[PDB]
Symmetry: C3
């Protein structure tokens, strides 16, 4: 269990370094500390060298306008910034630019496992969405492998 | 320890399904990620079939107006919405309607234990309170058992 | 590992009770549930009897104005409020008063370890910063020991 997570962490770090990764989200996180589960099939961030896709779509039991949200941006990846601390925690940012729409992305990975948290900020208003899930190399991602891109 | 939590989870799930449960809170959670402890005797959500009671009352060392809060609503339970993911995480919402006052409730339970987080939204303003604690069947709740309702 | 944290907790509690402690922060916490790592050398709260110093300075990969912040206040400690629950969790507040500037501090310590979370609220605007890290007695703090105060 501990060795299984440690290898996943190494794989996640190598995937970030290759710029070939998918964050497959399984929950949305709310400002008050609450969470709700979401489907990974339409909640992910995929980066494959200079191209990327973010898709978010949740319709949850969290009542009211904050419990439903989403965006899709498919295009080019730019402005990659990365920092790693002495413990192996990674903080990374980048933007995905589509046609008439973009999203700014901030991703954090804690040492020891491949759970990562991502904040997605679309360009059209000041609101953002924060999700968490598994950071995977492309070849271990069912999202990546389930279609021809 | 692991088997003790697993049974508590099963008990919590059966209690939600019976609509006979109490969430006994032991902390209040703040938007900035802070917490403060609270007394369970006046910080709970009780549902017993079509009737329910929410009582929240905290007066904490968290400085300023956000560190003190509360509401009491005693009445009928309505609009129950429930969803369960493939991992056994549960997201649930409902309202408690009193006389001239109501509260909308959102409750989440993670698989493997009976710790749950609840957000309480009274009808009179847009503010909300988020607490966490133990989700219990009525017959295991000292809140339920300590008085005749 | 469990006994190592338990002793650290006892040491942290004795340090708070002596009013001789340093919280050495290693991350900043964001309202959306994100975190970013920070350097401890300029991110700490030191209390030594009636005198204290808070220094915060982070310049992180979290994009935009919320990912950079800081304050330094060096002066006197006042208005100490402390509460401890039946489980050994501690919630504490106090202010550090400098010349023309002050900060209100809220610190929480969970039983069983010396990880603590602190919120710092400078007097000049309504914004605040929340960080987490290790709560240490003065004689175990490299911050304290690295200079003559
Ligand atoms: Mg936006
Ligand atoms: Mg309200
Ligand atoms: Mg302030």
């Amino acid at each position: 269990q501990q060795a299984a997570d440690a290898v996943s962490y190494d794989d996640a770090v190598a995937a970030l370094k290759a710029q070939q990764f998918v964050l497959e989200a399984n929950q949305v996180m709310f400002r008050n500390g609450q969470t709700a589960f979401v489907t990974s099939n339409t909640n992910f961030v995929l980066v494959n060298q200079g191209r990327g896709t973010v898709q978010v779509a949740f319709n949850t039991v969290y009542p009211g306008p904050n419990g439903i949200g989403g965006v899709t941006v498919d295009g080019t990846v730019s402005d990659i910034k990365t920092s790693t601390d002495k413990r192996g925690n990674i903080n990374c940012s980048f933007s995905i630019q589509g046609i008439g729409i973009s999203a700014q992305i901030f991703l954090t990975l804690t040492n020891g496992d491949n759970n990562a948290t991502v904040t997605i900020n679309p360009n059209f208003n000041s609101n953002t969405m924060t999700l968490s899930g598994s950071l995977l190399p492309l070849n271990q991602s069912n999202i990546f492998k389930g279609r021809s891109w």
